[PDB]
Amino acid sequence: PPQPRKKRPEDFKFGKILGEGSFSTVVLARELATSREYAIKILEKRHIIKENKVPYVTRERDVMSRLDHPFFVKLYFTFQDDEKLYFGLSYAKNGELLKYIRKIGSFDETCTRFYTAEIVSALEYLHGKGIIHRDLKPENILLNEDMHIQITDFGTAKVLSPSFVGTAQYVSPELLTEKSACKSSDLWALGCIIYQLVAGLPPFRAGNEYLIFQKIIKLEYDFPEKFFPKARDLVEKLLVLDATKRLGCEEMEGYGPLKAHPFFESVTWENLHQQTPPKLT
Numbered sequence: 001p002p003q004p005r006k007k008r009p010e011d012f013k014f015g016k017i018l019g020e021g022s023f024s025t026v027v028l029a030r031e032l033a034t035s036r037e038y039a040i041k042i043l044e045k046r047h048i049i050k051e052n053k054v055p056y057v058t059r060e061r062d063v064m065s066r067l068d069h070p071f072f073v074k075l076y077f078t079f080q081d082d083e084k085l086y087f088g089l090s091y092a093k094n095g096e097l098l099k100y101i102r103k104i105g106s107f108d109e110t111c112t113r114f115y116t117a118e119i120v121s122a123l124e125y126l127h128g129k130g131i132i133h134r135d136l137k138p139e140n141i142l143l144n145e146d147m148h149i150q151i152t153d154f155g156t157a158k159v160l161s162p163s164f165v166g167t168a169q170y171v172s173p174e175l176l177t178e179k180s181a182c183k184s185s186d187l188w189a190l191g192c193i194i195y196q197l198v199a200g201l202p203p204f205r206a207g208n209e210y211l212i213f214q215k216i217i218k219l220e221y222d223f224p225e226k227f228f229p230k231a232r233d234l235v236e237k238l239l240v241l242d243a244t245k246r247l248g249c250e251e252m253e254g255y256g257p258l259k260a261h262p263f264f265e266s267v268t269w270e271n272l273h274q275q276t277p278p279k280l281t
């Protein structure tokens with residue numbers, strides 16, 4: 001089937017910078033012919049080559065192409081000039097989730113349940129496709145116009161066949177003990193995010209990267225008294241040192257028992273994207 005002739009930088013009115021990575025920068029752009037707002041990720045080839053990140057960029061482009069679900073940022077086009085790589089991404093109008101965490105303090109039982117369910121529904125999909133995020137954090141979970149999640153940053157994503165260490169606060173213990181990640185890394189990360197939604201802060205916190213890692217392996221963290229009981233139980237079934245005993249993994253019989261947890265008693269999994277998100281306090 002004949003696809004539209006490659007896009008060019010000149011087809012856009014580039015605007016404000018939205019994000020700044022080490023290898024990339026994300027710019028808000030408006031397609032002139034169509035009036036559309038894309039989040040264009042700009043990567044400089046020389047730097048990618050120099051810093052030996054070609055397989056990283058390849059993987060990213062390949063993984064985003066494989067994704068087709070409403071809780072994920074979509075890839076529309078890719079084009080390149082003499083010095084840069086451009087990725088045409090979906091523009092989440094309301095930005096990062098961390099913005100809403102920091103802005104309202106911490107989430108109520110209804111909000112924590114709805115966004116947790118959206119993240120679970122998203123991971124069930126991603127894992128269904130045998131893809132692992134490897135760096136799931138509130139900085140990577142964005143909010144669209146509708147206030148529904150849109151997961152991004154697939155640079156570090158890994159496609160399983162039959163390495164990289166993410167953000168310190170969300171690193172699972174096994175990553176510090178064998179340098180090996182699986183579906184269970186993403187479930188440990190989810191355990192942190194939930195703790196972060198209820199208590200307004202990540203679970204493991206310390207003066208530097210070393211003390212954080214020390215806390216993670218020792219499993220040194222504690223629930224504030226003002227924490228929902230049902231959410232507390234869920235967080236304890238996820239922040240488990242034994243990677244094979246995390247609620248949601250294949251050893252634990254997958255996503256069935258996770259979605260089945262009392263903290264999601266009222267959640268209707270089958271149509272979250274169609275549901276009207278609760279008002280953020």
Ligand SMILES: COc1ccc2nc(-c3ccn[nH]3)[nH]c2c1
Pocket residue numbers: 018019026039073089090091092093094095096142152
């Ligand atoms: C509230 O303003 C913002 C701030 C940062 C943003 N980053 C994206 C984005 C990245 C990839 N897709 N969308 N949209 C944003 C909106």
